[PDB]
Amino acid sequence: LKYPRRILDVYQILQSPIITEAAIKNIADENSLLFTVDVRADKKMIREAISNFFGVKVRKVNTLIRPDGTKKAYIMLNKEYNASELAKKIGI
Amino acid sequence: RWERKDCKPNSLPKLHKRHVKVGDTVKVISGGEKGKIGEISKIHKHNSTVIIKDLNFKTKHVKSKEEGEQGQIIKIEAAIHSSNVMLILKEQEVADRVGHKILEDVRKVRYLIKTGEIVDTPDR
Amino acid sequence: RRICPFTGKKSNKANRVSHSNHKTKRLQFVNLQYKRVWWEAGKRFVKLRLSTKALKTIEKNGLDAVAKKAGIDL
Amino acid sequence: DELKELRTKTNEQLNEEILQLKGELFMLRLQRSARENFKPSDFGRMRKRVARMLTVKREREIEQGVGKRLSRKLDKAWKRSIVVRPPPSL
RNA sequence: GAGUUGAAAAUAAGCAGAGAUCCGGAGAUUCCCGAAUAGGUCAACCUUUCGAACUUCUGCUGAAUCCAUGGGCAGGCAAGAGACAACCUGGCGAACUGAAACAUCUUAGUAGCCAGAGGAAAAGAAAGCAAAAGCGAUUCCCGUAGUAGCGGCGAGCGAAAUGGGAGCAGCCUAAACCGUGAAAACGGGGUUGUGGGAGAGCAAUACAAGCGUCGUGCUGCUAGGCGAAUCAGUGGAGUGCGGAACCCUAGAUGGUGAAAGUCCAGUAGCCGAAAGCAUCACUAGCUUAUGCUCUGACCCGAGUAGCAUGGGGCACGUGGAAUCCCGUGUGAAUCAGCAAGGACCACCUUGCAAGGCUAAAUACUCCUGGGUGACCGAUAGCGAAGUAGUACCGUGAGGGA
RNA sequence: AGUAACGCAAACAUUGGUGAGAAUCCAAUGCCCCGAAAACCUAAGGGUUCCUCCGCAAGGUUCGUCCACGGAGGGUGAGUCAGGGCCUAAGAUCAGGCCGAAAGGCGUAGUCGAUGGACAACAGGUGAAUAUUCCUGUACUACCCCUUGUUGGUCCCGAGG
RNA sequence: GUAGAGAAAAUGCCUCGAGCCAAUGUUCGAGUACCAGGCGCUACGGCGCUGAAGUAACCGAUGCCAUACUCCCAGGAAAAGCUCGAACGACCUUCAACAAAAGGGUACCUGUACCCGAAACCGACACAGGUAGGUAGGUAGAGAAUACCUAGGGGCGCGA
Structure with a gap:
């Protein structure tokens, strides 16, 4: 069996984006974007909940x-996807 | 103002049982504005007080805008206590107490104890 | 503990008295000594920590009824 | 407003509807963060409806007859494998 | 039955006369730490073979050792762990003090510490008191009584019996004997005292009472409901004052601009439970069971009682020191007996130790629900009427507004 | 009593600026001080004191437009750096085992326990607050897939280190 | 390579190997980087374009070689990672396991600000005190003392 480190209610592992001006700097300058997650989270559980939703x-x-x-x-997407065209769809 | 906040058994405020519903025609019994009819507008169950229309006159001063303009003087009603009012039928002009008649159906309605009509309003 | 498992003999809180009637505590306790007594239901020695009154029981009455009176044998 | 349909739906569409309402709740969190015009009442009855769904599912856990800790091991045995999927509202 | 999304206003959206908010009964969830429990941990974290770890129970396999034991594996809504102010029990157990010093003694088997457990606990059904007359388990209160005593006969300590009340309730077990098994057990019998039981034989049948998932019964509680009777004048406001009326099965209370029987919530009274709990009364049912005669044989709780010592505690400080319980060592008798009746012996009287279990009266408050107060009113009353064991101090125990 | 003091005797001065108000805040020019620091970074500790804007009720031993102060918002990005997912020392806890009024004491396996042993990233730029962490260059670790062979392999055990 | 109960090891015997070790070093990384300067506007706080030489020698480390040698007694941790390997013991077996050769893919939690020879830590203070470790420029000097200074940071929070 493939267990994670902790079973943590995966439809609530992300909480809210961050709408500061430096986040838009990370979008236009980094192809990245900013989320607020709970403390009980991973680089394996958040990373799976972005490539799916x-x-x-x-x-x-x-x-x-x-x-x-x-x-x-700070989640950085691939080069193939602009974060600006995927962030205006959400409302950034 | 902690001396006057709401008492809270199990985090919910203790609400009082009263005798005045909205849309009723109350008369001020004794205090101040004695002997004038009126509808009620907004209800305050925790104080057992009721604001009634166009009688209680509290001329209050409001800083209106954030630019410091026009500063309006608004004449706003205040809360008279629920024991200072009675109910009124417009057919017999007399201030009367209340009573709970249990009619032929299951429902229980209000009743002016001296006249013979019903305070209770239908669904409209 | 300084108790015998067969017969429930414990220590005795008993003061000692000098000539001028001075009294200390002197916790007084039994001679529950190490032995290794033969057992007929297994034909073999058991290592026990027995008081001498319990020794007189297991030689007088036999180890079976005394050990079942205590409740333990193994 | 009585939710009579929830005791009619079978357990699979019950559970799939739980996952869909949780995904729609995350979309309401994104639309709340985006400051687009949203209904906070839908944010209320979303989670508040998932409470109804899990009470009906837990009553269906009761009338079979199993322990509370068996429902812990069964529920956490299910929660470990939930692949994230966006809702069908696109 | 009419508005609600706590304090706590405002704003945005709802939810609601096919009954919302709220109240009550029974359920569901209850992340993480904490008995904390998969393992570690520097509590609220980490690692995870996602696990009630360990002890106990059940089942299989079954080491040195044949049976065993230990171990391993598994099952289990799975019994225990942890917490609890005070009272209660069990164990360790002081000292300042009093004696005008101080060691015997007292303070004191109190405080404290640990363990356990219940709404009560302990004790408790006569090997008992008593005195030639009698009582009938234990506990508690008044009394005897500050008496008899005990005590460097100092300081002090201090019963008990007779009497009067609260509350009453008594039952299981071992042995002698029959039956099965190598014992160890099991099933019947018997458990009592101006003696019973076992063995042998004769009679004889049903009156009364005890225990109880189960559900109809009753009241009570946890939501509530109806519920009598007035206006007007007065300097802000009237409930006060003055004028006119009424209720009372209701004039307890709290509020309302100001003090209220007639303003409100209520009260007196009459009602009301789907669901749970409790109170005694039914119920399929299990049970208790009887009387006589003969028989001193057989039995009536053994390393026990007693004794020599070392003590403890009974008010009794080793004293004439009995009763009760223990340490070492010796070590009985079964009813024709044994123990007690304050060394001990003889007679009589009383009871039957060495096996267990029991409600009530009884002591207390971290509390809960009612009613009170010659109790307080912000230096008081709880430390605390707001962030109160908070800010602050200490490494911490802890102190503390 | 409006008295002592205002916390070294490195030392400031002027011109401008901001404001209602400037010895004290800012800017420039000289002057002066430390310089095995009074410089820069990290261990501990502190816990938001860091940064922008706003304010000057209290604090700053004076003032204040300033602030380690008050309010609102933001900020701490690691496969390679430091710890844990590895290991043990002192020491602790110790299954069973011995002991002991209780609590617990002794003690073996075992398990924790870095101040040590093992293990892979450097340079330039960005930037109100982050840089071996973000961007770009070149690297290096630990597993999987893709091609050749092998039927045995892993762990425990024996040894070197 | 053997020999003994002898797989590895250890011990004993035999044989082959004149070299070995490590800082330093050349090249790639590495220049269409960095850099003095000039060139154009100032919210005058800086951005924009272009860009030369980028070598040698003397000193010389308290840093490396380096747990390198010499001397001494007061004789100088442990375990895992790593490497080698028979029997015995537990499990899985053929497109499963093992060892490599290039090439792609994947990248676990916590700490990361700021002060840290201190106004923020510890001394009740924005306290003439204390606080492990690292970097150690020039001149005069044996020197980390001293005197004055580069970098960098201040003028010590009452003045006249």
Whole structure:
């Protein structure tokens, strides 16, 4: 059997995007975009929940904790997909 | 103002049982604005107070805008207590108490205890 | 513990008295000594920690009824 | 507004509808973050309806007759394999 | 039965006279830590073969060792762990103090510490008190009584019996004997005291009472419902005052601009439960079971009682020191007996230890639901009427507004 | 009592700017100080003090337009760096085992336990707050797939290191 | 290579190998980078285009070789990773397992700000005190003392 490290309610593993101006800097400059996830999350569970719900090959998943408690995730997509054409569809 | 906040048994506020519904014609019994009829507008169950139309006059001053313009003076009603009002039928002009008649159907309706008509309004 | 499993003999809280009636505590306890007694239902020695009164039972009454009186044999 | 249809639907379409309403709830989180015009009441009855769905599913766990910890092992034995899928509203 | 999405306003959208919000009964979820329990852990995390780990129970396989034991594997809604203010029981157990010092003694078997357990616990059904008269398990209260005593006869400690009340309830088991098995057990019998039981024989049948998933019964509780009777004048406001009326099976209370029988919520009274719990009363049913005569043989709880010692505790400090329980060592008798009646002996009286279980009266408050208060009113009353065991201090125990 | 003091005797001065208000905030020019630091980075600790804007009620031993202060928002990106997914020392906990009024004491296997042993990334740029972490270049680890052979392989055990 | 119960190892015997070891070094990485300068506007805070030489020698490290040698007694951790290997023991077996050769794919949690010879840590203070470790420029000097300075950072939060 292929167990994950922790079973963590995968339709709630992502919470909200970040709409700061530096996030748009990461879109136009990095082909990346910014999500807010819960602390109980992975570079294997978030990375699977982007290539399925969105339909995009994700390059890397750079995560960090934020001292108010919640977790911040810079997800960088592949070169084949612009983050600007996939972020205006959501509302960025 | 902690001396006047709502009491909360099991996180929900204790709501009072009263005798005035919306759309009723109340009379002010004693306090202040004595002896004038009126509809009620908005209801406040925790204070047991009721705001009624076009009688209680509280001329309040409001800073209107954020640009500092026109600063309007708005004349707004306040809360008179629910024990200071009675109900009124427009056929017999007399302020009367309440009563709960159980009619032929299952429903139980209000009743002016001195006259013979029903306070209770249908679905419209 | 300083108890015998067969007969429930424990220590005795019993003061000692000098000539001028001074009393210390002197916890007084039984001679429950190490032995290794033969067992007829297995024809073999068991290693036990027996008080001497319990020794007089297992030689007088036999080890079977004494060990079933305590409840334990293995 | 009575939800009479939930005790009519079988367990597979029940569970698929749970996953669809959770996905629509995540779309309501994206539309709430996007500041597009949204209904917060739908954000209420979405999760509030998934509560109805899991009460009916858990009653169906009850009338077979199994333990609470067997429902823990069965439920967590199911939650480990949920491939994410977007809702059919496109 | 009419508005709601807590405090807590505002804003955006809802939910609702095919009955929302809310209340009550029974259920569901309950991330992570914490008995914490898959393993580790620096609690609320990490690693995961996603696991009730360990002990106990059941089942299989069954080491040194033949039977065993240990181990391993498995099952299991799976019994225990952990928490609990005070009371209760069991064990360790002081010292300051009092004696005008202090060691015997007291404080004190109190505090404290550990363990356990219930709404009560312990004890409890006479090997008992008593005195020639009598009582009939245990517990608690008043009393005897500050008496008899005990005590460097100092300081102090201090019963018990007779009497009066609360509450009452008594039952299972071993042995002698029959039957099955190598014992060990099992099934019948018997469990009592101015003695029974076993063995042998004769009679004789049903009155009364005890226990109880199960469901109809009753009241009570956890939501509630109806519920009597007035206006007007007065300096902000009237419930107060003055004038006119009424209710009362309701004049308890709280509020309402201001103090209320007639304004509201209510109250007196009458009602009301789908669901759960509790109270006693039914029920298929299990049970208790009887009387006489002969028979001193057989039995009536053994390393036990007693004794020599070392003690402890009974108010009794080793004293004439009995009763009760233990440490070492010795070590009985079965009813024609044994133990107690304050060393001990003789007679009489009383009871039958060395096997267990029991409700009530009883002690207390972390509390809960009612009713009160010659109790407080922000230096008071709980430490705490707001963030209260909070800010703050300490490494921590802890202190603390 | 409006008294001592205002926390080294490195030392500031002027011109402009901002404002209602400037010895103190900013900018420039000189002057002066540390320079095995009074420089830069990381271990511990602290916990948001870091950055933009706003404010000057309290704090700053003066003032203040400034602030490690108050309010709102943001910021900490790792296969390679440091720990864990590896290992053990001191030490701790110790299954069974011995002991002990209780609690627990001793002690073996085992398991934790870095201050050590093992293991793979450097240079330039970006940037109000991040850089061996983000971008670009060249690399290196640990597994899978793609081609040749092998029927045995993994772990425990024996040894070198 | 053998020999003994002897797979590896260890010990004993025999044989082949004159070289070996490691900092440093040349090239690629690596220049259509960086860089002095000039060229055009200032929100005058900087951006924009172009770009020369980029070598040699003397000193010389407390850094490497280097757990390299010499000397001494006071005699200098453990286990895993790694490498080699028979029997015994548990499991899986053929397109399964093992060992490589190029080429692609994949990349586990926590810490990452800021102060850290301190105004933010510890001394109740924005306290003349304390705090492990790393980098060690020039001149005069034996020197990490000292005196003055580059980089970088300040003028010590009352003044007259």
